[PDB]
Amino acid sequence: GSHMQTSFKTGDKAVYPGQGVGEVMGIEHTEVAGQRQSFYVLRILENGMRIMIPINKVGSVGLREIISEEDVKQVYSILKEKDISVDSTTWNRRYREYMEKIKTGSVFEIAEVLRDLYLLKGDKDLSFGERKMLDTARSLLIKELSLAKDCSEDEIESDLKKIFNLA
Numbered sequence: 001g002s003h004m005q006t007s008f009k010t011g012d013k014a015v016y017p018g019q020g021v022g023e024v025m026g027i028e029h030t031e032v033a034g035q036r037q038s039f040y041v042l043r044i045l046e047n048g049m050r051i052m053i054p055i056n057k058v059g060s061v062g063l064r065e066i067i068s069e070e071d072v073k074q075v076y077s078i079l080k081e082k083d084i085s086v087d088s089t090t091w092n093r094r095y096r097e098y099m100e101k102i103k104t105g106s107v108f109e110i111a112e113v114l115r116d117l118y119l120l121k122g123d124k125d126l127s128f129g130e131r132k133m134l135d136t137a138r139s140l141l142i143k144e145l146s147l148a149k150d151c152s153e154d155e156i157e158s159d160l161k162k163i164f165n166l167a
Contacts, residue, residue, distance in 0.1 A: 006038045007055050013147075014042060014063035016053065020143065021046045028052060045150065067107050072148040075107055079115040079163045086116055095133065102136050107144035113137045118164040 006027035013023050022042035029038055030052065039052035040063065053063055086094050098116060101109035114137035117130045126134050142149065142156035149155035161167050 007040070013065050014040065014053070015066045016063045019044070019051070020066060021146070022051060027055070045146070067144055067147060069147050071107055072145050075111045075145065076159070076163060078108060079111050082119060082165055084116060085119040088120075091120060098133060102133065102140075105140040105143075107140075110137050110140040110144065114141050114160075115164060118160065118166075122166075124160065124166055 006029075008024060009026050010024055015022075022044045025041040025043040027038050028041045029036065031037070038055045040055060042051040042053055042063075043049075044051060094116060098113040101113045114134055117126055117134045117137070118124065121127065121130060125131075138157070141160075142153050145156045145159070
C-alpha cells in the first residue's frame with residue numbers, strides 16, 4: 001500500500017482536560033450523519049473504554065501528554081524520606097500549604113501532600129479530616145504516577161507501602 005495515516009498512531013500517551021486516563025491506539029474513521037471524519041482511538045487504561053477525540057475540533061492539539069517516567073522516579077525520591085513526619089501542632093498550619101497543592105494537583109506537590117498525611121497516621125487508614133485531604137490527593141497520585149503503573153490502581157496505591165513504609 002501507500003496512504004494509511006492521519007496524525008499520530010500508537011506510540012504516545014495523550015491527556016485532555018477532562019479524563020487523561022488513556023493511551024493512543026491509532027486513528028478510527030467514523031461517519032457523522034454521512035460525513036467522513038477522523039478521531040484518535042484513545043484506549044482508556046482505567047477499564048478499557050474507547051474515546052474518539054476529534055483530530056480537527058481539538059484545533060492545534062487539544063490532547064496534551066502528562067509527565068513521563070522521569071518525573072515518576074524523582075517524585076518517589078521526594079516521599080522516600082520517612083523523616084518528613086510533621087508534628088500534630090504544626091499539622092493544622094501544614095493543612096493550609098497542602099490545601100493549595102490540591103488545587104494545582106501538581107505531581108511533585110500532591111505526592112508530597114498525601115505523604116505528609118500518610119506519615120502523620122503511620123498507616124493508610126487516616127483519620128476523618130486527614131482522609132478528606134488524602135482522598136483528593138490519592139486520586140491525583142495514581143493519575144500522574146500512572147506512567148510507571150500502566151496497570152490497575154493497586155500498582156501506585158501499593159507503591160506507597162515501599163515509600164511511607166506501610167507494608
